[PDB]
């Protein structure tokens, strides 16, 4: 997976910021942000979500259907937010906008 090819619209500094946020909230360091790590992230960001809200956020970008976010899926959140592709009620929008990222 090349995030430089896949997401050229992202500066290389923005990309390492995103890697940093990703590594922060992947507590277990398995390379994924799972449902509980996402829940904690939305709380620590100040935009807590319902349990089923968190599952629907993951499903929006869970391209391999395993219920957890790999780093390429986590990048896709900000790609979709940046391109205006998120539904207006999506928790991913709140993740992006509460995140300290633009
Ligand atoms: Ca994890
Ligand atoms: Ca996944
Ligand atoms: Zn996977
Ligand atoms: Zn897109």
């Amino acid at each position: 997976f090349n995030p430089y090819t896949e997401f050229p619209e992202f500066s290389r500094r923005l990309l390492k910021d995103l890697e940093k946020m990703f590594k922060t909230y992947d507590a277990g360091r398995d390379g994924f942000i799972d449902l509980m790590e996402l829940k904690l992230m939305m709380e620590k960001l100040g935009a807590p979500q319902t349990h089923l809200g968190l599952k629907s956020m993951i499903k929006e970008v869970d391209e391999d259907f395993d219920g957890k976010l790999s780093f390429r899926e986590f990048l896709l959140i900000f790609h979709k937010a940046a391109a205006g592709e998120l539904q207006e009620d999506s928790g991913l929008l709140a993740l992006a906008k509460f995140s300290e990222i633009d």
Side-chain angles (χ1 to χ4, degrees), residues 32 64 66 68 70 73:
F32 306 105
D64 66 354
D66 53 13
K68 67 203 178 171
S70 67
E73 296 173 337

Side-chain angles (χ1 to χ4, degrees), residues 26-30 32-34 37:
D26 181 12
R29 311 234 300 231
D30 61 347
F32 306 105
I33 290 177
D34 59 38
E37 299 166 311

